[PDB]
Each structure stands twice: as structure tokens, then as C-alpha cells.
Amino acid sequence: AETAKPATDATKAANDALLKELPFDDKTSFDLAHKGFIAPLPAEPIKGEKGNMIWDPSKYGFIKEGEAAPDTTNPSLWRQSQLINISGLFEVTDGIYQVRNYDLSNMTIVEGKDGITIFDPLISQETAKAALDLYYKHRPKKPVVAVIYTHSHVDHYGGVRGVVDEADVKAGKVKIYAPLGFLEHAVAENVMAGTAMSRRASYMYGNLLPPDAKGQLGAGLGTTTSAGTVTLIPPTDIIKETGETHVIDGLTYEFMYAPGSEAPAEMLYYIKEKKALNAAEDSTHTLHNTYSLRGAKIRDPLAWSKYLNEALKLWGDDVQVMYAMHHWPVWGNKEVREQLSLQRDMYRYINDETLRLANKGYTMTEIAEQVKLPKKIATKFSNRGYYGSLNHNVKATYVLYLGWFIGNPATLWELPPADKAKRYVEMMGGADAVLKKAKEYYDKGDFRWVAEVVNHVVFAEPNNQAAKNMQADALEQLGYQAESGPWRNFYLTGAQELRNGVQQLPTPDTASPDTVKAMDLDLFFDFLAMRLKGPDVADKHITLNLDFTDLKQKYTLEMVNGVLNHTEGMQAKNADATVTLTRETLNNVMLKQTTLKDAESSGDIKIEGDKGKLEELMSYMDNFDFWFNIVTP
Amino acid sequence: AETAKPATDATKAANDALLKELPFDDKTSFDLAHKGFIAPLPAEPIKGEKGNMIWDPSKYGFIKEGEAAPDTTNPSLWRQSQLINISGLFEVTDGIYQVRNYDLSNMTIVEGKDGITIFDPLISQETAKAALDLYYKHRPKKPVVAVIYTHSHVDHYGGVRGVVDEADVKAGKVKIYAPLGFLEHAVAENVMAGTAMSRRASYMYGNLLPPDAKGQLGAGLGTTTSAGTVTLIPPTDIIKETGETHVIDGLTYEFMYAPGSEAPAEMLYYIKEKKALNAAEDSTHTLHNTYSLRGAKIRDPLAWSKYLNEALKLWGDDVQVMYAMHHWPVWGNKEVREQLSLQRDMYRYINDETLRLANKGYTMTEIAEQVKLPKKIATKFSNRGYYGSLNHNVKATYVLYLGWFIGNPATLWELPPADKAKRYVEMMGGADAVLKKAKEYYDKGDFRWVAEVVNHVVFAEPNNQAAKNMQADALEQLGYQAESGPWRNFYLTGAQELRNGVQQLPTPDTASPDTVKAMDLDLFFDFLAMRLKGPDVADKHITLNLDFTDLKQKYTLEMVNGVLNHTEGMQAKNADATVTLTRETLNNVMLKQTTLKDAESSGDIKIEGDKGKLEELMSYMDNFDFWFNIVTP
Ligand SMILES: [Mg+2]
Ligand SMILES: [Mg+2]
Ligand SMILES: [Zn+2]
Ligand SMILES: [Zn+2]
């Protein structure tokens, strides 16, 4: 089995060119990333109760500040990887602390009148607990009086039970603040397309790669994701509009409601006494994703720009420090305004130039080839595509406005990848001839082309290892050149799977107990409907009446024409069966705590009518192999 | 120039195979389309002042009921084309009338206590006026007391000035009802990606083609769009929620708010006293567009399915007739329930099967190749893809959840069309070799392949007329096979432009006066920003303070880093200029009814400071040529 190759001369030249374009002599990022350092993270890796690795703080130890970029790494991404590994407890300003790099995200702690308020308690309960214990090792041991979730992604709420006990939330001693839409979007994320998204995420975050100079370097936005217990306590206080002001633990918070920017539900806020702005995840030290390669709904760069502009309008004159839920802070009114201004301009440029070029008749990939950020934006390291990339953001923006079809009817009804591949290979003279021609292009450094054309040989002949080896070599050079962590990881993971095959592993975790319980029945029934093997059951008809005795809510589920419909507040006259149960019992079955059959046996699920129909319906539900092929058919 | 070819044997076989799958002996569609006929449309074509054609009622006269489908037409689309040409004034039920095929859409008239209420007054004021005149020739001359726009597309409001005088709306004599988000979306649709959308629409609606058996047949949803004066009066009353009920002219309307279905702003409603359901454009006698090839944001088929399911829940037991804003009604409670139920199932099937296959690892085009509607749905003519197609809807649904990128990094950074074209052609032995090889595939009927591969020769060598001729022949055979009107039109227009070149004809110089007047300043300034030639002005900086005296509002415009930002409620300190004006004055400059220089000279635009900086900003704005290339670079 083939292994990683050296960087080609073409790769070295491409990376070296970046040294002239970017000001690597400027070390400002490092000063800011080290500023306010209090204490390092514990060296001991965090392990779960079951012995699983949750967080290894030395994972990317090979990446050291002061060490030159290996020639198999983009030097800008190497610089960023050094920066994101600067870890520990930091002071941002008087009374505001952050723990950085104990997870993908930062945890923030604000000292108020009587206690502390926690922002965005990481992905895992275990990392959040460790981050809070670190804070308490150095700062006074005062109670948590409030938690804020800045937005609806898992790395900003997942560890909540590690910092607060829900008994205190219920008793009114601790309030949890979140933007309008938080709960619905947090819970629904990774449900409907969860297997596709998580398998794609295994490429994105480089989880399958070795951490080394020819492997993964980190995700640009943070190093990687923890792998512990995801928890969720529903918020008690909802922020619904910008201008909203609340006193929390004696400090005055003014909010900006920012839906549809980086996340569906998101908010930024200013603490007036500290002249300190929380930019959430809308301004960090990278160009971010207006579209994530993991696979997600495409975001609106214009809305994002306008939120940054509104932040300037509201706080620009007064702000003294800006911090965010990833990366390090920026200090000084002038400096804060510059970051906000350049990033505002950057997201607007993506929007407006994509639209202008589309109105001129350019199509998706042509527009992405042309759009280049102005020098004043592009020469700041904070605006480089370490997580997002300009190219895939621009493509996504064309799709946001005009969809997938580029208008040329030659592209309306193309054959699928494996089918077109066979025809391409045939017309180019066969697999051997394609590889020989592709080699010439490779030696000229045209790896973008080699990766496209050799992909046809692979999809036509997936057992051709010579083809897979060459495709891997091409992807790998592109990986070596990639400034985006996610780009590098997609390329290098593709190369690895082509050389070695897909490694057979456990499906990872699926849905946390808290997440499942917070899921409304509408979402649950849509998820079951997604799993239905429609073509297998198109001629069949099952109607079930469900009665949830605790909720006093009734539903009709109707499997008909190969789909599963649901309706709240109805009961069918002619149902095959009536199913009576509590919501708790349903959660128990979905969390695989009891089987459907045992729930029926025990009487927790009572059935009137055809006793077999619920089991029958469930027997038509698909199951997904997590490790589906990506770089081969 | 080459011209249209006969149908090949492969095309005849593909079309003939459809006769075995669909019940062509069922004439229900025709019975329903003829039911309630009162009077025909006037035979004389509607012409504008310059004798421009606005509406020719004989345009598709060659398509006659009872006449066999020509072998260059899909027999299912031929059937639908006969149906949509059934024209005139019709009674739906007591007090509800429609005028059908005086435009792409229907106009509906409902008789109430004291007057009439008009729904969806067509595209052009001239067709809407003629439609109302026809009604008034056969029913009592009673005043219009209300207008309803069911959704935010131009064929459902554009002729409004033909049915009501805006003076009567201002007087409070006529109310105009619309769904929440109507005005924002209607104006944005006309404006932001307007050149791209309008040029793509020239393909979609077959406007450039001759109406004959080898040319355009109609759009499936309706014949074609009128070409008269597009107008807009902003609504007075906004429907925000599904519970919502209003008594309009002595009749009770119960509304369903249906955002993100066929349009971003859409509503359905039931008139209680008449047991009559208006399905807007969410249930018609075609599979519709969850994504429009014209270019638009992708829609949510799950939401669409759920709206149809909710209509069943709310009105299913009571409803006696359902009508819509395109096509003909369905009568009878059983029959209405069946159409709603089958279409509900169809849109859910598209959503759920796409997700399930994506979760199994299938990618966009692979999924679209596999998904096939179940027999009970697919064998009803009302569910065939005459406007939408299952294939492009399924592709869009993948993109809705997962975006443009299919996960395989070989496709992450492809070369643009012209650049990859050159390389494909080189590796296939040159243009002549490709054309000779492609002919073999063509003769085997593999037109989907020929259209993809010969497209490379065209993009590599745009002046190669032999290549363009072969590409045209392949597209044309696909056009002859298409069941979707928009598909047929895209294919046949592409063929025509390849054979003949792009034929330029007069198009509008600006947006309509009513469109511009309805635009809010946020949109106005975003549209200017889109036009900014960023790369040309990246190093320049212009700041303008605006004061709108009629509004009592101030703005700052800032051109910086190649973008144009705007901020409401701010004035910058050392601005280049302060500009004082009214919205009317600003609109006239955009509409080219006045000149900026003259508006300044006359005193309508008062400027302090650098009086030429506004002129300078305008000089940097791009202009768009409508007739951009689609089938050649
Ligand atoms: Mg596959
Ligand atoms: Mg072009
Ligand atoms: Zn995050
Ligand atoms: Zn319409």
C-alpha cells in the first residue's frame, strides 16, 4: 500500500509564493494569542467513564511555535495551526476569562456581582467541567449564576451539565439565556441528514488522519472536537431582538439578535461596564464558512456582513476589547473597529461580486475562479481562509441565489458519476492511456485537472489500484497546498482511503439523551419518515393512532404510497391499531434503553387492534452504514 | 444555419414507452377543464401602443384537442398542452369564476355581499383588464372591493392596475391582502439577480422559439407569459398566521400561511360559506418546481407536503371544490381529498427518499437517477412533471440539505468549464475525434452523453460550427423527449442558439416604476452595492451622508475595499459630501426619467461638500447586457 509522497516542485512554488504575498514578518497574532495567559491546561488526557478518549491536549504537539513550516504544509495554515494550539486559561479583561483549546470552541467566564456567568460550555460535559475546574483553580470559587448559549451549534452548549446542575435551573437559581430559535435549531441539527453529515465530517475534521506534517494539522477554527458526553438544558430566557438589555449578575448586557449568520440562531452582546464585545462566531480570526463542506444549509453572506456593520453602529465608538467563542481577543478601539470593518467588507464582497458576475452571465465555478478579495482584506491573517475558503463560499453564494443548475442545458440531465466515467475513459483510449496522459499533467503541476480526470478511471474501475494511487497523489499535493484546514483534511483523507480502503469502524455516537428528549414529536416523526424504505412498501397501507397519555396529545401516522405522514390532533376512524404510551416510554425505545417488543410486553405500550402493525411499520425502517464510500463508487 | 431534425428512432421509442405507463384512455382532465364554461376569450390579440404583441390567443392554435401527438413531442406533454389551451371565462362554483389562459396564471373573481374580490390579477395590466371586462360582460357590474395576491411571483400581482385604481386603495375603498413577506420577496425577485433570472427565463418559457411541433408547446403550468405592462400596488393587509380569519365582502376566509413552498411568501385559503379551497400554486395539475430552472432559491418539499397535509386536516372533511391560480378545478369531496393526498405524498416522497439515499452515501445526480414516484402517484396526469421535473427537484433537495459539494474531494476545486473543456478534448484526441466518437453514441440514442461530451468541444472551440451543430442535434432530441415544458424549452432554445447564434431583441432598460417605488432603501442600496465594480475601486474611499427629507431618515453610504456599505440612522464626520433629497427624486434617477447632473442642477438634489463624489460613485456602477451566452462561453 502506497504512502504519503514528498511535496512536488509545483507544490513548493505555490506555497513559497504565499510568503511574498502575506506579511509573515508580522507576529501580532502571536502577541494577541499569548496576552493575558494565566495557566496551562492539565497535561493528562481526559478519558470517559468507559475508557474512551475525550480530549488529548498533546494531539498536535508536533506543531511548535518558532518551528518552520514543513514543505508539505501551506505556510499560512502552519502559522494558524501554531496559533490555535496556544492553550490554557486567559484573562481577556478585568473580570472576563476564557479557557482556550480545551475543545474546538472557547469557554468564557464573566465575573459579576455575586458569582460567575458561563458562555458556551464546549462540546462535552467532561471538557466543560475540566475548563471550569481550571478557572476555579486560579480565580475565586463563586457560584455559577447564569449560562449563555451564543448560538445553536453543539460546541456552544454541549458541555452545559459540566458547569451547572439542572436542579438549580428548575429552582430558578440559574437562568440560561439563548437567542430566539436556539432550541428548535440545536435539536434538529444533524437529525435528518445526520449520517451523510457525520461521515463527511470525518473527512472535514481529519479524524481519520495521523497528526503529522503529511497528515492533519487542525481545523483552522480550532484544533479538533472533543468526544465526550453531549448534554443540553433548554434555555429559560430567550433573546428576541437587537437592542434588548438585561442585567445579569450586576452587569449590563446589550444584545444583537443575529439569525441566519454562521448559525440559524445566533446573538452577539456587549457588556457596557467592561466595554467588551462578544462577537459570538460571526467575527473570528479566519474567513468562516458561508457553506460548510460537512454539508449544511447555505448561509447568507450579506446578512452576515450587515450584522457586523450593525455591531459597528451600536458599539464601534465605545468598544475597548472584542473576544469571540473561537480564537483569541482583539484589544483597542481602533483594532476592534478594523477587524469588524474588514470582515464586514469581506462578507459583503463575497455577496455582491458573486451577484454582479452572475448577472453578467458567469456560472458557479467561473465566478469562484474570478472573485479575489481586495489586498487590504486579503493580506491580514485574520481574514485568510483557514476554516472557510473563498472559493467554496463563492460557489455556495451562486447556489444561494440561483440554485444548482448553471443554465446550460448540456448540464441539465447528465449521467451519474459511474456512468459518465465509463464513457470518458472509453473516449480517452482506456484506463492505461488515461493514466499515462494524466501523468504529464501531474508533472506540470496541474493537480486540479489530474484529480478530476483520474477520478473517472476510479469510478469506472474501482479495483484499479494504479488509478487510485495516482488520484491519491494528486489529492495529496492539493492537500499540501491547502490553506483551509477542512480543505487539507478532505484532500488528505481522500488520498488515504484511496490508498488503503475505508477503515471499518464503529458508527460513532448518534443522539444524546438530552437531545432526543428535547426533540419535538413533529421532528421525531419526520425522522422516522426519512428512514422508511419507500420503494419496498409503496403498495402497502398502515394507519396508526397514537395517544400520548402524559402529554394528552394524539397523532395519526399514515404509511401510504411509500411515505409516512403524520398529523397532530387527529385520530383515524379506520386505524389498523391504536397505540397508547407516554412520551418517556417513546424516548426509552429510541434511546435503545428498552426494545419495542419489551415495551409492548410490559404494557408500557398498549395496543388496541392489530397487535402486529407497529412492529410491521418499524420493520420497514432503514439502517445506515456510517462508513459509506466517498472516493470510490 | 442548420434547422430542426426529425425524431430519431431512440426518441420515438422513449416517447412510445410512456404510452404503456400512463392511462391515455382516461379523459377526466378534459371533462374538468371544460366544466363550467361561460364564454370564450376575445379572438383579437392584445397589442401595445407600438403594436407590440402583449397576448396572442391563437399562439398555440396548432395544438388541437383530439389531435394525435406529433412524433417530435412527448405524448404526455402534448396532452397537457391541449389542456392548458382550454381558455375562457368559467364558473367554479356559485359566486366563484375564473378566466383561464389569458395569461400564464388564472384570474379569479369572487362575488360577495356588495362587490367582487379579485385574486391574482395576471402578469400584465392589459390582460387583467381584458379578463375583468370579459367577466363583466357575463356577470353583474359590481365594484371591486378587494384584491388578494396569493403569493410573491409576478403572475399573481402584475396586472393589478388593470383591475383597480390605486386612488381607491388610498381612499380605503379597496383593500389588498397578501401573505407576510410578500412585498419584500416580490421586489427582491425582480431586482437582485434580475439579469441572470430574466435571461434564463428566456430559455425557460420558450419565448425565443417558434410555436410548432419542433418548437415550443407551452410551459405545462400555462401557455406562456404575457408581454404587457407590469404593475404593483403594495398590499394594505397582511396575513401572518394559519389560524387567521377575515370576513371579506360578507364571506369568511380562513387562511393558511405557507412560506417556503411554491414561493417564499404564499398563502392558501378556504371560503367557509362556499366550501371552496384556493390551493394557490401549491396544488395544481402538475408536479411543480421545488427548484426553478429559471434560477431561484431552492424550496423545501417537506414544508410543502406538510402544508398540503394541514389543508387536509383543516378543511378535508368539509371541502366541496378546490381551485387554484393555474389550471382547472377539482369537484367533489372525495376527489379534492385525493388530489391533496397524492400531492402531499409526492412532495414528502421527494424529501424523504432524497434524504434516505443521501444517508446511504448516494450523491446528487445518483439520487436523482434512482428516485421514482410510486405507481399510485405517478399514473395520475395531475402529478406528472409538466412544469417541475422529478429529476431536477430531487437534485435540488440534495443541495437544500447538503449544499453543492458532493463530498468527493476530486470535485472540490475543479477547473471552470472552458478550461476543463480544452483538457478533455485534448485527451480524447482532438475535436474531430470527439465528434466522430460522439456520433456513435448519438446513433445508439445516448443523447445525455452526447450533450455532455460535445459541450466540451463547444467550450474549447466556440467557433467550431460542426461541434455546435452536433450539440444542437443532441439537445434537440432530448427536447423532443421532455415531459416538462421548461425542460423542452431549455433544450430547444439551446439548440436554436447553437445553430444560429444569440438573436438580440429589445428588453427593458430599468426595473418598472412600480417595482422601484416599492423597493425599500435597504434593498435600493444593496442593489447599488451589487452593481459596484469592486476590483476597479479597491483602493478608493467615498463616504456620503444622505438625508431623506420626505422620510425623516439619514443614511451613510461608504464605498471602501471594493464594497458599498450602508447604515441607517448615522452620519459620518468627515464625509466627502452630504446629499439631501427625497425618495421620489432618487427613484427618478434610477428609472432614468431624470439625470443625476440635472437633478443636482435643478436643486432637487442638494449637496454640501464635494458635489462630484456622488457622480463618481455612480460612474463605478456596472451595467448588464441581457443577452449573455449560455450554450457557448
Ligand atoms: Mg457511491
Ligand atoms: Mg460564459
Ligand atoms: Zn463554534
Ligand atoms: Zn404562478
Curated annotation (Swiss-Prot), chains A, B:
GO molecular function: linear primary-alkylsulfatase activity; metal ion binding; protein dimerization activity
Annotated localization: Periplasm
Function summary: Alkylsulfatase that cleaves primary alkyl sulfates such as sodium octyl sulfate and the widely used detergent sodium dodecyl sulfate (SDS).
Regulation: Inhibited by EDTA. Slightly activated in the presence of Ca(2+).
Thermal activity characteristics from the UniProt entry: Optimum temperature is 70 degrees Celsius. Retains more than 90% activity after incubation at 65 degrees Celsius for 1 hour.
Binding residues annotated for Zn(2+) 2, in chain numbering: 155-156, 281, 326
Activity-pH behavior: Optimum pH is 9.0.
Cofactor(s) named in the record: Zn(2+)
InterPro entries registered for this protein in UniProt: Alkyl/aryl-sulf_dimr_sf, Alkyl_sulf_C, Alkyl_sulf_dimr, Bact_Alkyl/Aryl-Sulfatase, Bds1/SdsA1_MBL-fold, Metallo-B-lactamas, RibonucZ/Hydroxyglut_hydro, SCP2_sterol-bd_dom_sf
GO annotations of cellular component type: periplasmic space
EC main group: hydrolase
Originating species: Pseudomonas sp
Protein family according to the UniProt entry: Belongs to the metallo-beta-lactamase superfamily. Type III sulfatase family.
Assembly behavior: Homodimer.
Positions annotated to bind Zn(2+) 1: 151, 153, 262, 281
Cofactor binding mode and count: Binds 2 Zn(2+) ions per subunit.
Pfam (any one): Alkyl_sulf_C
Alphabetical UniProt keywords: Hydrolase, Metal-binding, Periplasm, Signal, Zinc
Domain of life: Bacteria
Biotech utility: The thermal stability and higher specific activities make it an ideal candidate for the application in the biodegradation of SDS-containing waste water under elevated temperature conditions.
Record remark on domains: Contains three distinct domains: an N-terminal catalytic domain that contains a binuclear Zn(2+) cluster, a central dimerization domain and a C-terminal sterol carrier protein type 2 (SCP-2)-like fold domain.
The protein's name: Linear primary-alkylsulfatase
Binding site for sulfate: 289-294, 299, 387
Record flagged with keyword Hydrolase: yes
GO terms of biological process kind: dodecyl sulfate metabolic process
The enzyme's E.C. designation: 3.1.6.21
